[PDB]
Design a binder for this molecule. Sequence first.
Ligand code: NI
Lengths: 103, 103, 103, 103, 106, 106
Amino acid sequence: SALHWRAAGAATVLLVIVLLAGSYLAVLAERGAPGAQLITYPRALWWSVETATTVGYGDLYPVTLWGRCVAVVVMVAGITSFGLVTAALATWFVGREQERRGH
Amino acid sequence: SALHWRAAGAATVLLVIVLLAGSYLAVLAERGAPGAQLITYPRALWWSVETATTVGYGDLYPVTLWGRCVAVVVMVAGITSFGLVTAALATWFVGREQERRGH
Amino acid sequence: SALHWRAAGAATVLLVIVLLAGSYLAVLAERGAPGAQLITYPRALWWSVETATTVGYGDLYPVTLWGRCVAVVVMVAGITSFGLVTAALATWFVGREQERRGH
Amino acid sequence: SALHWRAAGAATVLLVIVLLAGSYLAVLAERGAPGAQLITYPRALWWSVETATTVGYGDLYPVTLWGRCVAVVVMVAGITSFGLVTAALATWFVGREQERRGH
Amino acid sequence: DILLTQSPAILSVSPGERVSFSCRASQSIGTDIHWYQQRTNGSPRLLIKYASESISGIPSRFSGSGSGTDFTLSINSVESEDIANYYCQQSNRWPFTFGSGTKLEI
Amino acid sequence: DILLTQSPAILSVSPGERVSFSCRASQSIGTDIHWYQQRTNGSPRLLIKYASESISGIPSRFSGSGSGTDFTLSINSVESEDIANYYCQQSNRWPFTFGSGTKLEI
Ligand code: NI
């Protein structure tokens, strides 16, 4: 089927995977760091979504080098996904228009 | 009329709907949770807009599982909308260019 | 000249205008509100940029109905602009590709 | 090779450069300002990424006119890059579709 | 649970003088502070909302001020009909709470 | 309402010595702190803005320092013309406020 639709959805399974692994790696990297708050899975999951969507409320964030390395990956996955859908909706609107005109 | 323009606007009615329902569901889910601040409609509405646009100032955010579930929906609606317009403005600029050249 | 390039730049003059008016209207609406921090032009300008780019650090944000109404406009201008450029860079990459292939 | 792919990657070297210079200029501009927190390179680097991706957690932000001027550049580089990739993924999905149909 | 403290518990003033009741929150609540009046054997009556906003029907001599943790409810020209118990209540964080109350006395 | 406290209220110093006035805010205001000088029967005069920034025309012996809640206004080599009342004022949060003032005395 349509490429743009493959990667869009594919990026949605991937994002979810990174979102779950993120929560796990986050806790693992933050525990051991005095004052760290990203230390239990449940909220660590909420932190991931927050990050991936760049909403960043600031109620939770990493303080260790690895937690942050983990954050950069979640952010990038979030941003790459949300942008690979947009690029998909564009290839779709362009295709439909191209037919409502002649081609 | 033009598809890309239908969904763009349609996503704008939808977003507004999610924005209002969001405010309502937010309060409903957060009240009962000690320390929660998303507890009155007016500000809960300001929280929605904040979320939808991923500006997240951090002055208000959910602390309950359902408030957060509600937040994920508002965020996603905000992001999907703001990206369905971009994909629309692209199908528009592509159409005009395609005529200022020959096709 | 090219439409997509007109609106992109045009949205850049507009954004700057909204960014300046934003700073002015922000102060005007926030002063008078006990505890408000968006009360001097200089920082109010930094707040605008922050908002327009949805970076929201949370060091400054509106607390009055009008300040927030002002914020929604800045956010939307920021988001519409930054998305009207992307849609422009797309019409550009699509045009160049369409020639490096045959059309 | 493909233009859209040149600028996308090119914007990725540029972004990294701005990200590193950002960290350096940030410290340089913030030190000397009482109460400033963007004062050591390591975290200043984490601040850059945060900014570039507009995730803004609010754990670190500039307080001097120059730090902020530096922030506006990082934000814009981040936003322009992340949008020049999207515009690239669009020129790619549009090209593949245009062949899976006839052209 | 936010703790609103109203001290003094009793207030003595002379007819016509300006009086002021204090309410202080255990934490910053912005302006989410609201005042109520309760006379002998009556129910509470909203006097001020959001620290300073006026209510329709309440005598112009009633005013409010404050932010964060310090709030003040004032009454220009204390009369008869003002004799009563005053309470403050916050909406900032759940659950809502009430002050210990302050009794006005002429 | 931010509360700026200036203690001591009076300051005694010997000609030529270094003197320092304290101002402390009830909360963190960053550097939004500004100093004013007021001599007998005169109006206030801006001496320092944003805690440490200098003003054109003010003697180089006047300086300022601080952040958050603790601010200091200093004067290297206290003279005659320095005899006066000193006030601090904040712009961080609305409404602006003023310190209780400190009187210099040689
Ligand atoms: Ni064609």
